[PDB]
Amino acid sequence: MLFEVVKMGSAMQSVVDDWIESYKHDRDIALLDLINFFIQCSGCKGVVTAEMFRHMQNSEIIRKMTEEFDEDSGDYPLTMAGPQWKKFKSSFCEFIGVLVRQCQYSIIYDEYMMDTVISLLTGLSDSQVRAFRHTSTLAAMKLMTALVNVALNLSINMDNTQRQYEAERNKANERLELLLQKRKELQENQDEIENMMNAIFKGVFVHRYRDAIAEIRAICIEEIGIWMKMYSDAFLNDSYLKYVGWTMHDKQGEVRLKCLTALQGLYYNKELNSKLELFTSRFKDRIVSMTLDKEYDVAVQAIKLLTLVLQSSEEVLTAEDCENVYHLVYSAHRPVAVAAGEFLYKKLFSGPNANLVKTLVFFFLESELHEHAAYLVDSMWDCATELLKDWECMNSLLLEELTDRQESALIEIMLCTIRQAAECHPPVGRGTLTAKEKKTQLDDRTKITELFAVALPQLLAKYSVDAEKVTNLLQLPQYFDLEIYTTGRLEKHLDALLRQIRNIVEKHTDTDVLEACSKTYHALCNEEFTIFNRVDISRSQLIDELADKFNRLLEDFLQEGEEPDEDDAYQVLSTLKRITAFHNAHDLSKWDLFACNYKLLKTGIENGDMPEQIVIHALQCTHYVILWQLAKISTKEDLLRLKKQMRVFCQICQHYLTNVNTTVKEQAFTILCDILMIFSHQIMSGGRDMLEPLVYTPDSSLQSELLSFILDHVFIESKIEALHKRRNLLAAFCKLIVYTVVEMNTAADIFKQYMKYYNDYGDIIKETMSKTRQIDKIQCAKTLILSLQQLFNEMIQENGYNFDRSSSTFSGIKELARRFALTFKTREAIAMLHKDGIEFAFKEPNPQGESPLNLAFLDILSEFSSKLLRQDKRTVYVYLEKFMTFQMSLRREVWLPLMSYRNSL
Amino acid sequence: KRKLIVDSVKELDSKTIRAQLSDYSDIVTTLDLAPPTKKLMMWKETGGVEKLFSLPAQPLWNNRLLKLFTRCLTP
């Protein structure tokens, strides 16, 4: 009952001992019970009988058992999934190992038991039946490993008995004879065991590590790894290493993984081997190349091995080898990054920490792959967590007595450590909370807050002139537990911050710096904290200055004055930038600056010459004035004025949509798509009374204006830069579609590009199609056909009515037509699709020969008849015959589109 | 016809192993980087069809204003 006992069972040693029990009683019935076990473990349902055992050779048994296999599927026990089969496999392996180990002193040498088992496994491992070849190979591999243990024990026993002999050769002659006899008997035992291993190795391993099946190659390499780690004195030489050397070049990841796991076992925990280092130096090149293996799981192990190789020597590796591994700290995949990061640590990381902090800066500065530290830092997070949270140390180097390229980089690194400590997740793309982690977090914030509440004002003071450094330092307060400004009695420092921020705003015109200032002032102006009122005063005061400066500049600027020149403009722009950035994050309605901005946008139209950058920022600025007034909405005198400004602003954005300046068109376009969605029909939707007066629906003129822009500016022919802008514009328009601010028929000009622009815009167009299917199954499929219609008429205008249906243009529409079909209330749609395709096919008649025309559309329309539907097919045909006539139906020769469409119905 | 899996070819021949050592360019690749700049890092965070259809085209830094947009996001 062996097979069933091993899967269903009870301890393994219990059934092995029970088996050894029976083998003593009757060898032959027990060996037969053993034969069958190995067979039945392969999924076979046959049985080897006593008569077969006594008489047939293995080749004949295996044949009979292939016949009697009686399988349902191609499944066999070692390939079925689930825990009960994982437990089987381990039970299967435990039993073989425990059987041999329990026989190693008597039975194993009886000339009967092992030759039988080995002969069978050698034959089964030769079978073309995979279930036999797979199972028997695993068996023989476990069997071999059990024998390496026996050999090892023997060697140990041989050495002890040898020491016993020599101690007596010193010193009697009767015991000497017994020790000589014992030593003789053990040497025989060693020879016998080496035979058995050599049978299995040359009979199975040498053929089967090379099997066509990858799972079988992996089995063989796993155990050769085990033999060398287990009895290294006997197996850790080139004559066994070479197999793992070759198999490192295997075409499957799972095989290559095992070669690296095997070698790792030969370094961890213990060293050191001259023969191993020779092999490694001989295969070093191929190892470092595997740090970029196609399979990530393989790449990690390759780095981890290289980390172990580091411990032994560091002699074998070169600068270029190590430099290559360093690059991987910037890998997209975290396990690789972290593994490469641990390698980096042990290689180059050994004012106690100040030299390690400075070290990290040099590494980061020598990296020509990344311009920010978010990913370098995350890779180091697991191992150098102490170095990276040393903010007191990092803060000291920036202040108190090197080069300004190093100062910016240290600020960069510092901010990354802080963010990743503050918020507890890795940076984007590195992701995939516990009790003790939130503790460290809370510890981290208070340490950051307490240190940088005091240090940041000094830090801004020192580095205020540098835009890159300031943009970084300003991100800090967004990570504070702000309570500490009160309870820590630190309000003197807070005022210093608000002073340094204010000074920065006024000396800087760089867009990012001002964004940082604004976003920061917003973080501090949280009204769940005692601190709000202090900051609100400074906010309310900084902006009083900006508005007044802005009004006065706008006085000299609008009149004739002089000129206004390039210089008078940069004056306005600079001040306008500061105002716009703040109006985004902060409600500045208490300053009615629609007036100043409207006066600046309308004056730009009439004069026709207004510097791009001013126009852009006004457009942005008044967008925020409008939106903020809509935020605080009782009264109804304010409510009527909001629509005033809004309706007007939409007209201005519409005029600038045809502005000769391209980045200006785009600015006007994106603001437009924003307001249209905001003041859409959906404004009143959320339990809104007073929001039904503000609703805006664009003119049919504007609807086409917005489309003309997309076609010109999204659909033509670094550059990852340019694309991101265009996807953003497209989604801005598609939102108007899927939320029906704009007619769905506009999507026809967009759906037809799903293919021609499938990598740039595929997923955005694919979602627009879905959000119209889920919204209205019917008119989706309508405009969807109008797309293929529009592609069709384009082919005509460019070639005429001769097509050449074999052409690439025509074949292209058919291909898009098939992919549209897979997008299929449930069946009233395809009905509606074929109807319009038929209507369109017979839209225009032919003047002569014969009184054709537009008829070729049916070979495209034929791509949809596949989908639906027998009952509805009659209905379609009935609708088709309203158009086609008898002498049309009857002649077949060119008129092929119509016939082809008909076969499918 | 038997559902039993029988292999016509059981072993990779010695010559193809020799070839595997000679050329592994098809099981090796180029380094795939994470976002190499702050701008590109922010893009990856805020990119994809999901995020794009659920945010303004002109970014709004205040949630008071962002809600005015996201308020209108189901037909």
Side-chain angles (χ1 to χ4, degrees):
Chain A
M1 200 197 162
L2 269 82
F3 168 62
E4 292 162 345
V5 176
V6 181
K7 189 165 63 175
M8 304 226 295
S10 53
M12 223 67 245
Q13 189 159 293
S14 289
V15 51
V16 169
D17 285 333
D18 293 334
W19 185 88
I20 292 181
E21 213 169 85
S22 48
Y23 180 76
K24 289 161 176 173
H25 182 284
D26 195 334
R27 284 163 145 197
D28 274 343
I29 75 96
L31 270 192
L32 177 56
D33 280 38
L34 188 59
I35 300 307
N36 279 273
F37 169 76
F38 282 131
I39 293 298
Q40 293 174 359
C41 280
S42 312
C44 181
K45 261 163 278 297
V47 167
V48 197
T49 61
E51 291 63 38
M52 296 177 62
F53 183 100
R54 261 203 295 267
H55 295 296
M56 311 183 69
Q57 280 204 303
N58 288 340
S59 59
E60 303 151 19
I61 297 176
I62 298 172
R63 279 181 159 90
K64 173 71 186 160
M65 299 297 284
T66 307
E67 299 184 19
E68 292 267 21
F69 205 104
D70 198 14
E71 71 288 356
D72 288 334
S73 54
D75 287 339
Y76 55 85
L78 296 176
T79 47
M80 306 203 223
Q84 277 210 28
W85 284 118
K86 187 169 201 182
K87 277 174 194 188
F88 164 75
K89 170 174 161 188
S90 63
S91 292
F92 169 85
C93 292
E94 176 72 7
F95 173 85
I96 290 159
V98 165
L99 175 52
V100 172
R101 284 166 180 84
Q102 291 283 107
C103 288
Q104 66 184 290
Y105 296 125
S106 58
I107 286 166
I108 207 182
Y109 299 116
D110 71 7
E111 310 278 26
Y112 199 64
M113 193 263 252
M114 289 295 296
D115 299 12
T116 291
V117 171
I118 287 182
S119 297
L120 186 73
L121 294 198
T122 306
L124 287 167
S125 76
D126 192 50
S127 180
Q128 289 182 343
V129 186
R130 184 175 299 159
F132 287 158
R133 193 161 80 272
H134 184 163
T135 301
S136 70
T137 301
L138 186 62
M141 286 307 89
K142 284 348 183 180
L143 184 54
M144 174 90 162
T145 300
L147 289 178
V148 180
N149 204 62
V150 174
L152 185 47
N153 289 337
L154 257 179
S155 171
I156 280 161
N157 200 30
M158 284 173 70
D159 287 340
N160 291 329
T161 188
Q162 175 70 25
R163 270 181 300 274
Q164 218 45 253
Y165 172 90
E166 284 172 356
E168 274 261 315
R169 221 202 73 109
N170 291 347
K171 306 313 187 68
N173 278 314
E174 303 216 313
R175 177 172 195 248
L176 208 77
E177 272 276 349
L178 297 173
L179 291 179
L180 202 70
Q181 185 54 35
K182 195 190 193 217
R183 169 158 160 280
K184 197 179 295 165
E185 287 187 358
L186 294 178
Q187 183 54 77
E188 287 169 351
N189 281 1
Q190 187 191 9
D191 295 334
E192 187 87 81
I193 291 298
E194 257 151 41
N195 287 340
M196 287 165 21
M197 330 199 81
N198 202 266
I200 290 174
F201 189 77
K202 282 173 191 156
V204 177
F205 178 83
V206 141
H207 305 290
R208 212 50 37 212
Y209 92 96
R210 222 166 35 142
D211 201 271
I213 309 312
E215 202 172 9
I216 296 185
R217 298 208 292 290
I219 281 176
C220 288
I221 279 304
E222 186 162 34
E223 298 296 310
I224 194 167
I226 287 166
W227 310 330
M228 305 175 84
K229 154 148 150 178
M230 168 174 198
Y231 192 167
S232 77
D233 289 330
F235 283 94
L236 179 34
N237 37 266
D238 186 40
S239 106
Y240 291 91
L241 272 185
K242 61 199 221 281
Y243 296 95
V244 167
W246 301 335
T247 313
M248 271 179 358
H249 300 79
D250 197 84
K251 252 47 189 157
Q252 297 295 291
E254 286 311 321
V255 178
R256 290 196 307 278
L257 194 56
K258 290 335 216 318
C259 304
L260 295 178
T261 285
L263 295 176
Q264 282 175 3
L266 303 180
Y267 289 85
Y268 176 93
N269 261 290
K270 298 268 132 269
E271 278 150 357
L272 194 171
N273 197 293
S274 50
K275 248 289 185 66
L276 188 64
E277 272 179 12
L278 193 76
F279 165 92
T280 293
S281 72
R282 185 167 179 81
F283 281 103
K284 177 223 69 175
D285 286 330
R286 171 56 186 143
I287 287 173
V288 323
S289 78
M290 279 186 255
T291 62
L292 281 168
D293 190 284
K294 259 239 186 58
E295 291 245 14
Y296 279 135
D297 280 26
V298 178
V300 169
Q301 302 316 314
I303 301 168
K304 291 205 156 183
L305 179 74
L306 288 168
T307 302
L308 290 169
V309 166
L310 209 60
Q311 296 175 190
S312 64
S313 307
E314 297 119 324
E315 310 150 23
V316 180
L317 310 167
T318 63
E320 310 89 68
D321 296 325
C322 296
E323 189 68 25
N324 284 340
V325 177
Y326 294 156
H327 294 168
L328 301 179
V329 186
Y330 301 111
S331 168
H333 205 244
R334 190 168 201 274
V336 162
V338 160
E342 182 181 13
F343 179 85
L344 178 60
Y345 194 64
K346 315 231 291 219
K347 188 69 169 90
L348 299 184
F349 291 71
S350 68
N353 281 346
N355 208 50
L356 287 178
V357 168
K358 227 196 174 177
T359 284
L360 180 55
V361 175
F362 283 74
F363 179 78
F364 179 50
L365 282 169
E366 292 307 306
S367 304
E368 195 67 48
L369 276 177
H370 264 37
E371 283 169 9
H372 62 131
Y375 290 96
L376 162 55
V377 166
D378 173 52
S379 308
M380 297 295 244
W381 200 248
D382 283 338
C383 39
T385 202
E386 71 296 330
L387 166 62
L388 296 178
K389 287 190 186 177
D390 200 341
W391 300 299
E392 291 154 12
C393 170
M394 278 182 296
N395 178 227
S396 303
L397 279 74
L398 293 162
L399 297 178
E400 36 185 310
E401 292 174 357
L402 254 177
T403 66
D404 274 276
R405 194 183 162 177
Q406 294 170 350
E407 288 185 336
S408 49
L410 172 54
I411 285 171
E412 170 62 25
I413 291 181
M414 184 161 86
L415 180 65
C416 290
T417 53
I418 284 176
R419 176 176 53 207
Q420 180 147 9
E423 39 190 67
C424 251
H425 57 72
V428 72
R430 291 282 181 98
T432 70
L433 175 132
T434 77
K436 313 303 187 62
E437 276 147 46
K438 289 144 119 181
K439 192 179 174 167
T440 304
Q441 191 193 4
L442 177 63
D443 280 313
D444 280 3
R445 307 194 72 112
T446 35
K447 185 157 128 60
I448 286 166
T449 309
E450 287 178 356
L451 169 54
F452 286 106
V454 183
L456 179 55
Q458 313 176 234
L459 271 168
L460 287 173
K462 177 150 172 46
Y463 301 106
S464 53
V465 56
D466 310 280
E468 57 272 343
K469 296 180 177 58
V470 148
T471 307
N472 267 324
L473 291 163
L474 286 167
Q475 314 292 341
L476 278 160
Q478 311 184 359
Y479 300 114
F480 295 167
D481 172 26
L482 296 165
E483 288 179 12
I484 306 322
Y485 263 131
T486 284
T487 67
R489 297 193 155 165
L490 287 167
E491 302 89 344
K492 303 238 185 65
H493 303 94
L494 169 54
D495 284 319
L497 178 57
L498 305 166
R499 245 194 314 281
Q500 291 294 325
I501 294 173
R502 272 205 230 159
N503 178 257
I504 286 173
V505 168
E506 300 192 303
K507 73 184 295 185
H508 275 281
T509 66
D510 178 270
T511 277
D512 299 321
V513 178
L514 302 172
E515 169 172 333
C517 286
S518 181
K519 268 161 177 289
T520 299
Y521 248 109
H522 184 252
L524 291 170
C525 281
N526 195 357
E527 204 178 9
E528 186 178 349
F529 298 83
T530 320
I531 290 82
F532 176 103
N533 315 90
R534 180 180 298 262
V535 195
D536 191 17
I537 294 169
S538 35
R539 169 168 74 186
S540 194
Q541 281 174 186
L542 167 62
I543 294 178
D544 280 339
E545 301 183 2
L546 282 171
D548 291 30
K549 159 82 152 176
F550 195 45
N551 297 349
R552 288 161 9 213
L553 278 161
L554 240 40
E555 273 159 359
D556 199 55
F557 189 63
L558 300 175
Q559 57 181 31
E560 263 290 33
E562 317 80 347
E563 186 70 56
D565 52 331
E566 183 182 10
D567 292 12
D568 291 339
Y570 184 97
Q571 280 297 290
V572 183
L573 172 53
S574 292
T575 298
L576 167 57
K577 286 210 217 238
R578 309 192 173 103
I579 283 197
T580 301
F582 270 92
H583 209 326
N584 202 144
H586 313 285
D587 188 340
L588 304 197
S589 295
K590 321 203 301 180
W591 303 253
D592 183 42
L593 11 68
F594 179 94
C596 328
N597 272 320
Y598 177 68
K599 205 136 189 163
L600 182 59
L601 278 171
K602 95 181 190 167
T603 188
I605 297 173
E606 295 295 335
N607 213 333
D609 39 82
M610 180 68 65
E612 157 193 315
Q613 286 298 319
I614 294 185
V615 178
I616 298 313
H617 282 100
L619 275 171
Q620 270 174 337
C621 196
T622 142
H623 179 41
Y624 304 137
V625 178
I626 289 172
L627 286 199
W628 270 115
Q629 266 153 16
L630 169 58
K632 51 184 149 87
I633 276 183
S634 175
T635 30
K636 225 181 294 162
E637 297 77 338
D638 285 336
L639 176 54
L640 287 166
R641 184 182 59 97
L642 175 69
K643 194 182 167 70
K644 181 188 290 180
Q645 293 166 137
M646 195 277 287
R647 303 279 301 191
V648 173
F649 184 61
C650 273
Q651 285 306 314
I652 303 164
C653 288
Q654 174 178 311
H655 271 80
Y656 280 106
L657 200 47
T658 55
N659 181 289
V660 289
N661 192 307
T662 172
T663 68
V664 173
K665 290 172 180 184
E666 291 164 349
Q667 176 58 86
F669 177 79
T670 64
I671 278 170
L672 213 33
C673 292
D674 276 16
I675 309 163
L676 288 197
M677 263 291 297
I678 286 168
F679 290 74
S680 81
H681 156 64
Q682 297 299 316
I683 182 160
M684 57 180 261
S685 64
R688 302 285 187 249
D689 299 6
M690 19 174 12
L691 302 198
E692 80 168 10
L694 290 169
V695 174
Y696 190 92
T697 326
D699 322 333
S700 54
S701 84
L702 184 56
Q703 281 193 51
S704 59
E705 273 246 50
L706 299 183
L707 182 59
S708 145
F709 176 90
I710 293 290
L711 301 173
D712 294 339
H713 292 273
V714 184
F715 297 113
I716 300 180
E717 188 181 11
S718 63
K719 272 172 292 157
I720 285 191
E721 286 282 347
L723 193 73
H724 182 253
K725 167 184 84 175
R726 284 191 305 267
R727 311 190 83 231
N728 188 60
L729 294 154
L730 191 62
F733 188 79
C734 289
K735 283 178 297 242
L736 303 182
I737 285 167
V738 305
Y739 296 113
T740 52
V741 178
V742 71
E743 67 161 9
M744 196 184 289
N745 287 277
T746 50
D749 299 78
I750 285 161
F751 285 162
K752 64 185 187 195
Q753 322 278 6
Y754 168 70
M755 200 63 148
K756 187 180 175 169
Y757 292 72
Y758 178 77
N759 226 72
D760 284 11
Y761 309 138
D763 51 327
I764 296 173
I765 287 166
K766 180 178 291 184
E767 192 68 20
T768 307
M769 286 168 42
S770 285
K771 294 309 281 161
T772 44
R773 182 178 66 85
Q774 296 168 2
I775 269 48
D776 177 44
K777 190 96 172 166
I778 275 71
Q779 202 192 358
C780 184
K782 291 194 70 49
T783 56
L784 190 163
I785 206 71
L786 163 63
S787 279
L788 297 153
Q789 286 182 33
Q790 281 184 11
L791 288 183
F792 195 75
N793 295 347
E794 284 158 29
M795 171 174 56
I796 271 68
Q797 183 191 353
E798 206 70 46
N799 305 101
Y801 281 94
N802 295 103
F803 308 98
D804 183 22
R805 310 193 184 105
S806 294
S807 187
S808 74
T809 292
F810 186 89
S811 304
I813 297 176
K814 266 189 301 198
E815 177 53 30
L816 178 57
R818 185 184 41 87
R819 300 253 272 261
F820 275 177
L822 314 159
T823 304
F824 299 89
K825 188 63 170 59
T826 318
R827 314 183 299 179
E828 201 181 85
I830 294 188
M832 183 51 55
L833 183 145
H834 283 268
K835 287 204 179 193
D836 288 317
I838 286 164
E839 287 174 67
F840 168 80
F842 298 100
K843 178 184 66 188
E844 302 292 284
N846 197 336
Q848 289 180 339
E850 69 149 25
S851 310
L853 176 63
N854 250 359
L855 191 57
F857 195 66
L858 297 188
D859 201 38
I860 298 168
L861 194 55
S862 164
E863 295 285 1
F864 293 81
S865 52
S866 311
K867 200 68 173 195
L868 286 185
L869 167 68
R870 296 194 214 183
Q871 182 186 350
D872 287 79
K873 273 200 208 192
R874 183 201 262 201
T875 316
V876 148
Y877 203 127
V878 167
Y879 193 91
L880 172 69
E881 55 184 28
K882 304 175 171 13
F883 292 79
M884 67 169 310
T885 60
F886 189 81
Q887 184 71 341
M888 206 158 271
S889 161
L890 177 61
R891 82 182 94 187
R892 298 162 131 187
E893 77 288 348
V894 178
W895 289 76
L896 274 168
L898 176 65
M899 303 162 51
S900 295
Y901 184 26
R902 274 202 292 159
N903 286 67
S904 60
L905 295 167
Chain B
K1 286 180 284 175
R2 302 279 298 270
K3 314 245 176 61
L4 187 66
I5 304 171
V6 185
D7 293 313
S8 315
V9 162
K10 300 176 295 182
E11 297 182 58
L12 304 182
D13 66 76
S14 300
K15 294 220 198 77
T16 96
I17 299 237
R18 256 170 273 198
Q20 281 178 185
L21 307 184
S22 314
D23 181 27
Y24 50 84
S25 40
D26 59 329
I27 55 164
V28 132
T29 181
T30 42
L31 171 55
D32 184 26
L33 295 176
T37 72
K38 289 163 187 298
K39 199 160 294 313
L40 278 163
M41 189 187 159
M42 185 232 281
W43 287 2
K44 181 176 173 83
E45 174 194 309
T46 204
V49 308
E50 294 196 333
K51 268 285 194 174
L52 263 46
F53 277 106
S54 44
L55 294 175
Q58 191 60 217
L60 299 171
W61 303 341
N62 199 316
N63 275 357
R64 291 190 63 188
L65 294 201
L66 174 63
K67 201 181 176 293
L68 300 178
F69 179 91
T70 63
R71 195 174 51 181
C72 306
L73 292 181
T74 320

